[PDB]
Amino acid sequence: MKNVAAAERQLRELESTFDGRLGFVALDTATGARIAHRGDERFPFCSTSKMMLCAAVLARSAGEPALLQRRIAYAKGDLIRYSPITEQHVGAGMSVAELCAATLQYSDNTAANLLIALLGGPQTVTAYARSIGDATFRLDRREPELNTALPGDERDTTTPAAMAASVHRLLVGDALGAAQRAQLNAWMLGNKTGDARIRAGVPADWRVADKTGTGDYGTANDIGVAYPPNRAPIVFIVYTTMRNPNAQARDDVIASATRIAARAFA
């Protein structure tokens, strides 16, 4: 596809402007048109793993629906940095559904750890990924250590290609039941942390469901689905990481990469 080849050249040019790596897939789900850069390389996924985590919780809830209303009475000792919802409600507890919304929409780290514990540990999230056909994703640690993003470390990584297939199946396809898919979409449509990333690179009439991640080594990621009016959804997977341990994570590379693919796909 000629638009795809041109977009790939532009993504190479974009990567050449910084000392790091860009991992990218955009997939038009109707045609299968697929723009990719470093699609089969591993990247540290950081908080984008919270999407897989919450899909696993939703899957469990299909086998007990009241699970989402279960109150978790967590402790001050559970609280770790970057927990803007759980810190506010400690002493009152939160439901499992509220913890999912907090981890997806505010990237709440304590909420993620409480959900990992509910499921039985990080290995259960990896097992869930395997059950939906993702042989690549691996969740090795909990928050906040999963954000170390060390060069060459394969812990807490996936590939852009694997994550594109998983996002496709979860939000657009049938990996989840219809009610669970709708809830995951509704939560990700309401994300608060992504305004400068994928959301900033698409036309004004496209809706976006996304989950960001930010970590050490200037790591800045965003994954999700855009819903253009009168056309099929488009999956966007953007992973970036830097060689300098002192790098500042950026938003603008993700927005630029998104714009490249948006131009290609219309």
Side-chain angles (χ1 to χ4, degrees):
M1 306 183 75
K2 289 34 178 218
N3 57 325
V4 167
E8 292 186 358
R9 286 184 293 273
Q10 297 171 356
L11 289 170
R12 168 163 38 70
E13 293 162 354
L14 176 63
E15 187 181 62
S16 78
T17 71
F18 59 87
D19 192 31
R21 296 189 295 136
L22 171 62
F24 185 91
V25 176
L27 172 75
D28 181 338
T29 65
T31 61
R34 184 172 184 282
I35 298 164
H37 190 251
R38 302 190 184 281
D40 293 328
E41 301 187 25
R42 284 180 176 280
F43 287 78
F45 50 46
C46 301
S47 282
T48 70
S49 62
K50 286 162 178 155
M51 177 184 186
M52 195 69 75
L53 173 56
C54 292
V57 173
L58 285 167
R60 184 159 303 180
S61 79
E64 41 183 320
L67 176 64
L68 295 182
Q69 294 70 219
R70 182 182 301 173
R71 185 161 291 275
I72 311 300
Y74 57 94
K76 286 171 62 187
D78 292 309
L79 293 171
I80 59 167
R81 301 240 311 256
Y82 308 104
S83 296
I85 312 308
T86 52
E87 75 194 349
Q88 293 288 69
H89 296 294
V90 76
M94 291 170 60
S95 71
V96 169
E98 287 162 359
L99 291 171
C100 291
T103 207
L104 293 170
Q105 302 181 335
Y106 295 85
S107 210
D108 191 303
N109 274 351
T110 298
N113 280 354
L114 293 167
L115 296 168
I116 291 166
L118 176 70
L119 288 172
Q123 68 274 20
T124 297
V125 184
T126 304
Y128 174 75
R130 296 293 174 275
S131 81
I132 67 161
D134 189 331
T136 302
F137 177 98
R138 52 185 289 185
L139 185 68
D140 293 273
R141 294 174 293 170
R142 311 165 331 129
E143 301 278 7
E145 297 82 0
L146 68 82
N147 301 297
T148 54
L150 303 174
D153 190 354
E154 293 192 3
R155 291 179 297 176
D156 308 302
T157 65
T158 197
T159 68
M163 193 64 104
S166 289
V167 169
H168 185 188
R169 295 207 66 224
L170 287 169
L171 286 180
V172 179
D174 291 4
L176 286 162
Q180 293 76 26
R181 175 176 64 193
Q183 180 65 267
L184 185 62
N185 271 109
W187 281 330
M188 293 181 62
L189 288 162
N191 182 30
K192 309 306 171 209
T193 65
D195 290 359
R197 291 180 181 188
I198 295 165
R199 288 177 197 279
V202 299
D205 55 348
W206 294 14
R207 294 182 303 104
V208 172
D210 84 294
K211 180 72 197 82
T212 54
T214 305
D216 296 353
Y217 283 80
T219 297
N221 308 328
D222 200 10
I223 67 172
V225 175
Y227 298 102
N230 290 169
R231 59 189 284 195
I234 305 174
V235 176
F236 286 84
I237 303 304
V238 197
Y239 289 102
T240 74
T241 193
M242 305 299 167
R243 293 196 177 95
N244 183 3
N246 307 319
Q248 175 53 52
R250 295 167 64 172
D251 302 319
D252 66 288
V253 174
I254 295 166
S256 291
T258 299
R259 286 194 207 97
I260 286 166
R263 286 197 296 268
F265 287 157

